[PDB]
Design a binder for this molecule. Structure first.
Ligand code: MOO
Length: 232
């Protein structure tokens, strides 16, 4: 059985791994998930990667594939939501109000860097940059970023204590007890974090639509819900 090839935003690591297993349990169809920043995944797809399903951590990267004709609007829909959080290593005593002018930058200490997804392309980085900008904090940290290849890479920096703070998703924080949530960014500070899922237009996997459809089903949703994603 050709596995359904799912390209999933890095932040979907555990949830999609669980979903892949659960899908195969239910149907006997293996699901092979590849994780990266949604940007990387989208670019890989654009460049011909034979993904069957794409789950992005933002609409923009799905839009990108749509614009490239690789995803049909009919075959995409919003699946999950998240929050954006400021995290610190678990042991960190930092208290930071993202809204307080200069608070994030101060909490970086003398040489600390703010772990973020690469801010141009990685959805978590874009959400982060958007939130930072919106909150007037961007300038204070824009030269103090530890831009990372995905939100999980950013998480890792914080988890490893190599960044005193990072901006990841709420689910990422739940996914790693080695970080703690210092603050949740106001939902008004960034575009809603929405993970669209789409069957790729060119998928030739007979199970692609089934898999995507299945994600609407209670046990599939429950995987994401348990892992701190909001359900769209
Ligand atoms: O595509 Mo991500 O989950 O923002 O690294």
């Amino acid at each position: 059985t050709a596995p359904v090839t799912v390209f999933a935003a890095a932040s979907l690591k555990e949830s999609m791994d669980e979903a892949a297993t659960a899908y195969e349990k239910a149907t006997g169809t293996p699901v092979r998930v590849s994780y990266a920043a949604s940007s990387a995944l989208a670019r890989q797809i654009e460049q011909g990667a034979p993904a069957d399903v794409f789950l992005s951590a933002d609409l923009e990267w799905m839009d990108y594939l749509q614009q490239h004709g690789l995803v049909l609007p009919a075959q995409r829909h919003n699946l999950l939501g998240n929050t954006l959080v400021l995290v610190a290593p678990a042991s960190s005593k930092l208290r930071v109000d993202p809204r307080a002018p200069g608070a994030i930058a101060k909490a970086l200490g003398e040489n600390g860097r703010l772990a973020v997804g690469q801010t141009a392309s990685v959805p978590a980085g874009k959400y982060a940059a958007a939130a930072l900008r919106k909150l007037g904090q961007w300038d204070s940290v824009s030269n103090r970023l530890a831009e990372s290849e995905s939100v999980r890479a950013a998480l890792m920096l914080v988890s490893r204590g190599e960044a005193p703070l990072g901006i990841v998703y709420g689910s990422d924080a739940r996914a790693d007890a080695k970080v703690r949530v210092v603050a949740t960014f106001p939902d008004d500070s960034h575009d809603a974090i929405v993970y669209p899922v789409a069957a790729l237009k060119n998928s030739n996997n007979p199970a692609t639509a089934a898999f995507v459809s299945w994600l609407g089903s209670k046990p599939a949703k429950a995987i994401f819900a348990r892992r701190g994603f909001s359900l769209k």
